[PDB]
Structure formats: C-alpha cells, structure tokens
Amino acid sequence: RMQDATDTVRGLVVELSGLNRLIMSTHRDLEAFK
Amino acid sequence: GSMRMQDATDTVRGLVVELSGLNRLIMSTHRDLEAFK
Amino acid sequence: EEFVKVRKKDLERLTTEVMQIRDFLPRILNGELLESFQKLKMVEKNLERKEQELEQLI
Amino acid sequence: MEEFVKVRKKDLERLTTEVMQIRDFLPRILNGELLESFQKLKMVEKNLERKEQELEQLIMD
C-alpha cells in the first residue's frame, strides 16, 4: 500500500503560510518606514 | 488498477531547488549580520 | 480530491528545506531590522543638531 | 525502484503557492540593505559620541 503523505504536506502548508505572513508584515513595516 | 496517479515528483524537485536557494540566502544574510553585530 | 504520487525521498528533501526556513528565518525577520532603521534616523538628526550646536559655540 | 507516496493534488498545489510567495518576496527583504543599515548606524553613533564629547569638554558658560 502506498503511504498517504497528505497530512505531512498540510503541515508544511501551515508552516510556510505562517512564514509568508512574517515576510509580508516585515516587508510592509520596512516599506512604511521609508 | 486501470487508473493511475499523475507523477508530481518533478514539481516537488523544483520546489526543493527553490527552497534550497532561499535557504542559501537566509543563511548568508544571517551570517553577515552575525559577523557585524 | 484526487491523489498525485511523489517519490518519497524527494518529499523528504522538501520537508527538510521547509524546516530550515522555520528554524532560521525568524532569527533575521524580527523587530531588530526596523529598530535599526529607526535608530539610524534618530541618531542622524541628533548628530546634525549637535554639529550646529558646537558651531555656534566655538 | 524508489518508493512513491501519495498526496492529495489540491494540498500539493497549496504548497506550491506558498513556496512561490516566499520566492517572490523574501529577496525584497533579505538583501544588502539590512547590513548597510547596521553599518551606517554604528558609524553615526560614534560620530555623535565624538560630537557630544566635544561639547562636554567645552567651557562656554
């Protein structure tokens, strides 16, 4: 039986989604300063 | 069975390359700031 | 909600790279970047102020 | 052969989307401008220190 790695991938999406929030908020902070 | 799954391995391989390069940028930038501060 | 297949080792590589971003990105992207930009504008204005102050005194 | 695992197609598409957004925006923060700002801050701090020490050593009142 082929293993189902869907839940692993869903966890990576949650992780990268949070990292993208941090990137966007940091970028907008530096954008607003200058 | 008669129906088979699409192989998305090459897509994943491209993502690995993308993220590997982003990690190179993170590590180099972090070390630059580390070396100065 | 169909499935695709991926070589197990390649998905393992992807997980490793994602976890490295998790590990180190917050050690750069934090409040210290904006703080550095703000402090620089503050000290620059204080320098120019004290430069003119010393000029009017000597 | 090397073993396969299976993943719901739509969840892999989401992962791709998130990876590409990092690609798009991370280099617009991580570049030489961060280090340059820290280097510039340390330089002006020393020049302000040396300008305050000149005012402190001056007898003017």
Numbering used by the authors:
A (entry chain B): 540 to 573
B (entry chain D): 537 to 573
C (entry chain C): 22 to 79
D (entry chain A): 21 to 81
Copied sentences from the primary study:
Here, we identified an optimised construct for crystallography, which includes the α1 helix and the beginning of the α2 helix of MEILB2 (amino-acids 22–81; herein referred to as MEILB2α) and the core of BRME1’s MBD (amino-acids 540–578; herein referred to as BRME1MBD). Thus, the overall structure of MEILB2α–BRME1MBD can be described as a parallel 2:2 α/β-coiled-coil, where an N-terminal MEILB2 β-cap is followed by a MEILB2α1–BRME1 four-helical bundle that transitions via a kink into a C-terminal MEILB2 α2 dimeric coiled-coil. This consists of an anti-parallel two-stranded β-sheet, which is formed by the N-terminal ends of MEILB2 chains, and is orientated perpendicular to the helical axis. The hydrophobic core of the four-helical bundle comprises highly conserved BRME1 amino acids V548, L555 and I562, which occupy the ‘a’ positions within the heptad repeats. Thus, DNA binding is mediated by the rigid β-cap at the N-terminal tip of the MEILB2–BRME1MBD structure.
MEILB2 (meiotic localiser of BRCA2; also known as HSF2BP) was recently identified as a meiosis-specific interacting partner of BRCA2. BRME1 (BRCA2 and MEILB2-associating protein 1; also known as MEIOK21, MMER, C19ORF57 and 4930432K21Rik) was then identified as a meiosis-specific binding partner of MEILB2. The particular adaptations of meiotic recombination require several additional meiosis-specific components.
